[PDB]
């Protein structure tokens, strides 16, 4: 069934992701304040609350367990607030200042190369972070790559060293995927423009074992394009729109083992656009 | 004061020797028919047997277990002028391997038995020739190598000869080795041997005199005390003997206890790690039980048959 | 098995990865030798290298230990693990006798 929580906020929730296994609903708004929530049992209770932002917080990421109970903050402040729960209590452990604008999103990577907290800078870059133990995180960054700024963060998969890669995109229009090289300094491989309008959420598929790279790109123009690269040495995305969005969409989220697109857009309405056989996606809500 | 029992046991005929383990839930058994079998007491107290196998094709003189601080292990002697060396591995049924085995030994081995806890992981065997040569291995963890430490001569007919249980390194070890030759002259039927730490060698400490009847066996008990320990020799006459220390640190050799109550030559000697009995099995197949008193005193206590 | 671990069947996800076949591979860091029993030397593994005997002995059955043990990092000893859990599951002190509270030292 469903159960209901209720955000108590005095603004409007804009994020939300759950615990690996799924106790510890997050709430973001522009309170200025996120916090945890635990949802065991079907139940709602403010278990812990947080408060260290200056203006609205547009994100809420987790980490995988492995690495411990850590959580990530994306302020309009210009800020990474990482919040870690020790002893049974919330408490801040990390800041960063190393954007000149509001950070638009942080992903995590995948756990079996580390911990990075990439996130991108809007102005024309972005910002990789990872941890190197003892409280030392060194924040490497990107050198003017959009054009107005990036806005969403999107993590490849891991595969068979273990050559690191993510895709991204902003309101240039268009959506790149950012490789890093073997010396540690990233280098562009790829560029796809496609979008008539500012891309908002770019999402990149979760892989199974298949020969096959999947990524769903929203956009301001309200176009849902599975991109889809049937050779690991092609290279080439060959997009196929879905759907036609009366507005702008807004998110983009996969399903556990790559079946089922997650949507919402302007309508205030959320299609759980999943494929067919023909090819073909239809919306089964 | 006496109470004899039987218990169902499953058994052909007469063995050659058995023993025992210091958890009281293990024993083995080495029949005539040279094959080696072990019986396990369980937690209600039931003996059930867990192995049987054959050792070699002489017969299995006798059977000496091992300590508990080095691991599962039994220890062969075959009248086949070898030695077996057999350590149960279950995969659970047991399964028993001989993973080393003794056989410098021209002739047939009399006994062997583990030497002291304090010495490490060695042993000993004393054949018909008055030859005993004793054996250290120092891979503890590795069974299948065996260094022959060293090697002594008794010139006298060598049948059972106990190590004595001085172990602590605050003193120096000992071992008695004992004879059953049936020399027409009179001689001394036991002899003290102790190693030396400075020379790394063993000398006849002293050549127990007093002895000269036949003797089947030797039993020494575990102090555990304060000063010294005491003997026995099973022959015809049953006599216990207390040395009293002053190369070799001399002895006081004398009598403490001597019982002929069993009227016949002594095969097998009872065991006491508390002091106070001195039991012995002879000839005549009544079980003869002796101990101390109030007055220090050695009297016999219990008596009980064979069947 | 990524699945299965965040389902919350531990067990199940090694079972499942008992069947890869490329290595296991061993972690590098921080490793745990101990003090010989006889010799007192640090040996990696579980007989000596001089003495060739058993390193660890039970402080409980004073017996050679080669299987499952726990031990503390405060007091330096350690023990059987069904034996510990015994000792433990009553008892606030070091059955070595040295006053390490464990239950607090090594519950890090
Ligand atoms: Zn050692
Ligand atoms: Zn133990
Ligand atoms: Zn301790």
Same mark, same amino acid.
């Given at each position: ?285 | ?57 002489? #017969? +299995?003189?006798? *059977?000496?277990? /091992?300590?508990?601080?080095? $691991?599962?292990? %039994? !220890?062969? @002697? &075959?009248? =086949? ?26 002739? #047939? +081995?009399?006994? *062997?038995?583990? /030497?002291?806890?304090?010495? $490490?992981?060695? %042993? !000993?065997? @004393? &054949?018909? =020739? ?26 006298? #007919? ?150 | ?108």
């Amino acid at each position: 069934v469903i159960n209901t929580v209720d955000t108590s906020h005095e603004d409007m929730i804009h994020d939300a992701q759950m615990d690996y296994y799924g106790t510890r609903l997050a709430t973001c708004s522009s309170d200025r304040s996120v916090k945890i929530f635990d949802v065991r049992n079907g139940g709602q209770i403010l278990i812990a609350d947080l408060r260290g932002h200056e203006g609205p917080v547009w994100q809420v990421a987790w980490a995988h367990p492995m690495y411990g109970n850590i959580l990530a903050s994306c302020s309009y402040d210009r800020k990474v607030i990482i919040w870690r729960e020790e002893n049974g209590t919330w408490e801040k452990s990390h800041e960063h200042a190393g954007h000149d604008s509001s950070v638009n999103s942080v992903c995590w990577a995948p756990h079996d190369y580390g911990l990075i907290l990439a996130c991108g800078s809007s102005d024309g870059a972005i910002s990789l972070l990872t941890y190197t133990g003892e409280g030392q995180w060194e924040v490497k960054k990107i050198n003017n790559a959009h054009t107005i700024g990036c806005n969403a963060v999107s993590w490849a998969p891991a595969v068979v060293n273990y050559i690191k890669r993510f895709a991204s995109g902003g309101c240039d229009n268009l959506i790149k995927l950012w490789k890093e090289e073997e010396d540690g300094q990233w280098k562009e491989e790829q560029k796809l423009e496609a979008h008539s309008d500012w891309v908002r959420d770019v999402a990149w598929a979760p892989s199974i074992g298949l020969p096959t790279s999947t990524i769903a790109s929203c956009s301001q123009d309200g176009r849902v394009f599975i991109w889809t690269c049937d050779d690991a040495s092609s290279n080439t995305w060959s997009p196929k729109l879905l759907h036609k969005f009366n507005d702008v969409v807004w998110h983009v989220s996969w399903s556990i083992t790559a079946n089922i697109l997650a949507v919402s857009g302007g309508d205030n309405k959320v299609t759980l656009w999943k494929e067919s056989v023909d090819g073909q996606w239809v919306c089964i809500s | 004061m006496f109470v004899a029992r039987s218990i169902a046991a499953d058994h052909k005929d007469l063995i050659h020797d058995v023993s025992f383990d210091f958890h009281g839930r293990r024993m083995a058994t080495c029949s005539s028919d040279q094959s080696v079998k072990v019986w396990d007491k369980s937690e209600s107290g039931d003996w059930h047997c867990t192995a049987s196998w054959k050792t070699h094709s002489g #017969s +299995v003189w006798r *059977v000496t277990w /091992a300590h508990p601080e080095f $691991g599962q292990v %039994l !220890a062969s @002697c &075959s009248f =086949d002028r070898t030695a077996a060396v057999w350590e149960e591995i279950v995969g659970g049924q047991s399964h028993w391997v001989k993973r080393t085995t003794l056989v410098d030994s021209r002739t #047939s +081995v009399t006994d *062997v038995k583990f /030497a002291p806890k304090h010495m $490490g992981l060695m %042993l !000993a065997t @004393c &054949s018909a =020739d008055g030859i005993v040569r004793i054996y250290e291995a120092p891979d503890v963890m590795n069974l299948s190598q065996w260094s022959l430490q060293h090697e002594i001569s008794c010139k006298l #007919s060598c049948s059972c000869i106990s190590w004595n249980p001085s172990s602590s390194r605050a003193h120096s070890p000992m071992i008695a080795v004992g004879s059953d030759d049936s020399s027409p002259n009179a001689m001394a039927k036991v002899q003290i041997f102790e190693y030396n730490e400075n020379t790394r060698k063993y000398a006849k400490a002293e050549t127990l005199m007093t002895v000269t009847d036949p003797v089947h066996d030797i039993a020494f008990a575990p102090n555990l005390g304060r000063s010294f320990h005491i003997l026995a020799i099973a022959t015809k006459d049953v006599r216990i003997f207390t040395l009293k220390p002053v190369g070799p640190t001399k002895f006081e050799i004398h009598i403490v206890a001597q019982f002929d109550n069993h009227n016949s030559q002594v095969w097998r000697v009872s065991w006491n790690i508390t002091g106070t009995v001195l039991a012995s099995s002879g000839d005549d197949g009544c079980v003869r039980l002796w101990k101390a008193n109030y007055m220090d005193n050695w009297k016999c206590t219990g008596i009980l048959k064979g069947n | 098995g990524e699945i299965l671990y965040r389902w919350g069947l531990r067990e199940k996800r090694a079972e499942v990865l008992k069947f890869v076949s490329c290595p296991p591979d061993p972690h590098k860091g921080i490793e745990f030798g101990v003090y010989c029993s006889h010799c007192r030397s640090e040996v990696r593994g579980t007989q000596c290298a001089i003495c060739k005997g058993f390193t660890f002995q039970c402080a409980i059955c004073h017996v050679a230990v080669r299987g499952s043990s726990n031990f503390c990092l405060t007091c330096g000893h350690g023990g059987h693990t069904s034996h510990m859990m015994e000792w433990f599951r009553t008892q606030e002190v070091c059955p070595t006798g040295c006053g390490c509270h464990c239950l607090l030292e090594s519950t890090f």
